Amino acid sequence: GRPRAINKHEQEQISRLLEKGHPRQQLAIIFGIGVSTLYRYFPASS
DNA sequence: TGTTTTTGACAAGA
DNA sequence: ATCTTGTCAAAAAC
């Protein structure tokens, strides 16, 4: 029912970004999504 | 006015 | 202060 916070384009865009050392705190705000959401798609075990 | 799928705030971390 | 993770009421969508 409810749509996903981030599709795939940005799902990997983002993913690729974290690898370059970006702060979830910031990514979350740009992309207008909750931080919990991010730690969910990409755990600190990634 | 009801279910479902995913979010986001929050609490809590031998 | 940070940084993580899992729980849970409910927003979003039909």
Domain ranges across chain A: 1-46
Nucleotide nearest A34 (Cα, C1'): B8
Helix (H, G, I), strand (E, B) or coil at A16: helix
Q: Name the CATH architecture for the domain at A1-46.
A: Orthogonal Bundle (1.10)
d(CA A17, CA A23): 9
Backbone angles phi, psi at A16, to 5 degrees: -55, -30
Here the tokens at position A38 are: 């991010």
**Which experimental technique did the depositors report for determining this structure?**
X-ray
Dihedral of CA atoms A24, A29, A30, A33 in degrees, nearest 10, equals 90
Nucleic strand B contacts from chain A, 4-23, CB < 7 Å: 4-6
Nucleic strand C contacts from chain A, 6-25, CB < 7 Å: 23-25
Resolution in A: 2.3
